[PDB]
Amino acid sequence: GSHMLREKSEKFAFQAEVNRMMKLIINSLYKNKEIFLRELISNASDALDKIRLISLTDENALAGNEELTVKIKCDKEKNLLHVTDTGVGMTREELVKNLGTIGTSEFLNKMTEAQEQSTSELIGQFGVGFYSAFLVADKVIVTSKHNNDTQHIWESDSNEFSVIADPRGNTLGRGTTITLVLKEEASDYLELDTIKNLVKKYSQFINFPIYVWSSKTKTVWDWELMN
């Protein structure tokens, strides 16, 4: 039918607290923007722990994708940064609720009173590092495939968000791809050497293999282990 796209039932507004949280994060870490990559990798790691746990009790947990990895790709031409994990993934309902809504009050006051020291650790602690992606990106896209649902896409420029069934079908198998449309002034993150340095620094203590799609010398491209 056409009733879905004709009723904008895929459009959502963020919860007030999430709006306030995004601002605090953006205003707090304005001087240390590179941490966004650390947070995405951390979230990726957590997603992997979750499916690994589920695989303990569910023999079919890994049916959609046998690997447990984090792969980072730079698309300079497209101005896109991709961080893909083969973790638990998220259902449509989870994309809407986990990303659009949120000890939040305390954290709110904590974050404010934290900007009168630092918020870098607090963000990781409360698990809202995802939103730091907006420090370097104008648009944040989340493509996710959960075992209990079909692949879906969540997109946002921070002023609202939408979730749609992925017309490409199940291409992830299981997992999540965080796609960042980098702000013009954040083009440096499209550089391999830069991403490699950061990835290696923030992946050092991740219990899962983390790869960066890189080139080697003709010139060939392939996954390069960073940790």
Whichever domain contains 37, its CATH number is 3.30.565.10
Count Cβ atoms within 10 A of the Cβ of residue 159 and give its class: 0-12 exposed, 13-18 middle, 19 or more buried.
exposed
Tokens of 38: 């650390």
Q: Give the resolution value in Å.
A: 2.2
Distance, in Å, from the CA atom of 111 to the CA atom of 24, rounded to the nearest integer, reads 7
Amino acid at 161: F
Residue 83: beta bridge partners?
72, 178
* 98 annotated as ligand-binding: yes
130 carries a ligand binding annotation:
yes
| 209-221 core/surface letters (b: 16 or more CB in 10 A; e: else) | bbbbbbeeeeeee
Q: 85 a known binding residue? A: yes
List b or e across 130-158, with b for residues whose CB sees 16 or more CB atoms inside 10 angstroms.
bbbbbbbbebbbbbbbbbebebbbbbbeb
Query: What string of H, E and C letters represents the secondary structure of the chain?
Result: CCCCCCCCCCEECCCHHHHHHHHHHHHHHHHCCCHHHHHHHHHHHHHHHHHHHHHHHCCCCCCCCCCCCEEEEEECCCCEEEEEECCCCCCHHHHHHHHHCCCHHHHHHHHHHCCCCCCHHHHHHHCCHHHHHHHCEEEEEEEEECCCCCCEEEEECCCCEEEEECCCCCCCCCEEEEEEEECHHHHHHHCHHHHHHHHHHHHCCCCCCEEEEEEECCCEEEEEECC
Least Cα distance to 72 among 38, 22, 29, 24 occurs for 38
Cα R_g (the chain), whole angstroms: 18
Q: Give the phi and the psi of residue 148 in degrees, each rounded to 5.
A: -85, 10
**107 is known to lie in a ligand binding site:** no
Q: Quote the CA–CA distance of 68 and 35 in Å, as a whole number.
A: 23
Nearest to 67 by CA among 46, 51, 78, 53: 51
* Residues 6 or more apart in contact with residue 40 via CB below 8 angstroms: 83, 129, 130, 133, 178
> β-pairing, 175-182 with 80-85?
antiparallel
In 3D space, the residue among 145, 168, 149 whose CA is nearest the CA of residue 87 turns out to be 145
CA torsion, points 142, 107, 101, 185, in degrees to nearest 10? -40
Instruction: Give the closest residue to 210 by CA, choosing from 64, 36, 45.
Output: 45
Strand partners, 210: 70
Alpha-carbon distance of 93 to 30, in angstroms, equals: 31
Q: Which domain holds residue 32?
A: 1-227
Q: How far is CA 74 from CA 160, 171, 191, in A?
A: 26, 19, 7
Q: Per the structure, how many domains does the chain have?
A: 1
The CA distance from 127 to 130, in Å, is 8
* Residue type present at position 212: V
